[PDB]
């Protein structure tokens, strides 16, 4: 998230993430981030 | 926590050339963009310059167009600004600004600063 | 261009006082202002980027607000390490990074 | 062990009576089924 | 965009009989295959 | 079965969604379970007739 850069949307970039404790807190509490809105899940259990 | 080390300052005659280098340490500059600004010594703070993160994008000052050429060496992590033709007006304090974003012209600021060098053009 | 004027020049309080320090802009920028804090004896610092986002290690007393033309900057504790000269920056129009005068600030 | 607890592994909820289980899993199986579809042998994350 | 391999080990054309191949090893590579070649040794 | 909802596990739907579309998915599943009870019970009411 706190990447400098992007890439572009047909060469979009994929990044991989496992064995690892996920806290989604830190998404959750910051303004910026206005779109929020998930499928299949709802937010708030994200935590558990 | 992040270090802007700069050198090349002095005093010069007007009509001569010096040159500047600012080094940093403290974080990965390869996506970075820079910018050199000035200050008078009597007066506020002033933008000079600036480079992105790899040399595409180069932006000077309308008063110095022609003059001021920018440089950076990505592998040694470091910035150099060579001032050319130097007059009495340009014996102000020199900072070396890191931009937050990657590109030269983007609403995104300066977020760390370093120690200004001191320049003098006269005799 | 762009012409970006200081209505206070030099103010004064003690350490238990809330200042404000206003800038304005001749144009709309669209709440691309920055602020930035320059210590007489070291380099300067910035303060807030963008209109109201403040910048992280540093103390939550400043508070940016404003909007269009002017903008707007609060302390609300003046710790005795708040005297500096304090910029305006604008980052919008075509000069590029064109800065403000300067705002003395002095405790009394 | 042995009594009715209300158990959550790895984010699979139920009540139940934990007991030991004689059954063979492969090295890999990770869960189990019955022939009625009903989750009745598990494998501990913290302790295989 | 995983790549599962099975295997199995048996002490003995193809011998008639019925063997499970237990799920060996998950590769996580995402690419795309369509041609391939063994390994020998000489 | 899961008779149209997501997954066929009560305790996964609680422990995934949150109660407004919850409650849509359980509904589900509850009406899908009470018709198959209905056509056991009448298959075993002609069949003990």
């Known amino acids: 998230f706190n990447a400098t850069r992007f890439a572009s949307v047909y060469a979009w970039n994929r990044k991989r993430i496992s064995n690892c404790v996920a806290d989604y807190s830190v998404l959750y509490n910051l303004a910026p981030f206005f779109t929020f809105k998930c499928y299949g899940v709802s937010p708030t259990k994200l935590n558990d | 926590e992040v270090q802007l080390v700069e050198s090349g300052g002095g005093l010069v005659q007007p009509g001569r050339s010096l040159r500047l280098s600012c080094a940093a340490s403290?974080?990965?500059?390869?996506?970075?963009?820079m910018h050199w600004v000035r200050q008078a010594p009597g007066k506020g703070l002033e933008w000079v310059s600036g480079?992105?993160?790899?040399?595409?994008?180069?932006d000077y000052a309308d008063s110095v167009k022609g003059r001021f050429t920018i440089s950076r060496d990505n592998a040694k992590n470091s910035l150099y600004l060579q001032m050319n033709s130097l007059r009495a007006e340009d014996t102000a304090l020199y900072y070396c600004?890191?931009?937050?974003?990657?590109?030269?012209?983007?609403?995104?600021?300066?977020?760390?600063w370093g120690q200004g060098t001191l320049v003098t053009v006269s005799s | 261009d762009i012409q970006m004027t200081q209505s206070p020049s030099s103010l004064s309080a003690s350490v238990g006082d809330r200042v404000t320090i206003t800038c304005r802009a001749s144009?709309?920028?669209?709440?691309?202002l920055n602020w930035f804090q320059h210590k007489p004896g070291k380099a300067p610092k910035l303060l807030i980027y963008?209109?109201?986002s403040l910048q992280s290690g540093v103390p939550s007393r400043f508070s940016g607000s404003g909007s269009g033309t002017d903008f707007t900057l609060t302390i609300s504790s003046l710790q005795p390490e708040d005297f500096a000269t304090y910029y305006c920056?604008?980052?919008?129009?075509?000069?590029?990074?064109?800065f403000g005068q300067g705002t003395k600030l002095e405790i009394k | 062990k042995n009594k009715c607890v209300n158990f959550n592994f790895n984010g699979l909820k139920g009540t139940g009576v934990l007991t030991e289980s004689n059954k063979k899993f492969l090295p890999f199986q990770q869960f189990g089924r019955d022939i009625a579809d009903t989750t009745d042998a598990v494998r501990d994350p913290q302790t295989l | 965009g995983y790549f599962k391999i099975y295997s199995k080990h048996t002490p003995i054309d193809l011998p008639q009989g019925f063997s499970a191949l237990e799920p060996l090893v998950d590769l996580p590579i995402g690419i795309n295959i369509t041609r391939f070649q063994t390994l020998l040794a000489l | 079965s899961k008779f149209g909802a997501i997954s066929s596990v009560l305790n996964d739907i609680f422990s995934r969604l949150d109660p407004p579309e919850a409650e849509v998915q359980i509904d589900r599943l509850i009406t899908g379970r009470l018709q198959s009870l209905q056509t056991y019970v009448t298959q075993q009411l002609i069949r003990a007739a």
């Open positions: 600004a890191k931009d937050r974003g990657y590109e030269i012209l983007t609403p995104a600021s300066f977020d760390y």
């Open positions: 403290g974080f990965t500059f390869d996506d970075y963009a």
């Open positions: 144009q709309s920028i669209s709440s691309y």
């Open positions: 480079i992105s993160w790899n040399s595409d994008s180069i």
């Open positions: 920056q604008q980052s919008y129009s075509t000069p590029p990074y064109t």
């Open positions: 963008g209109a109201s």
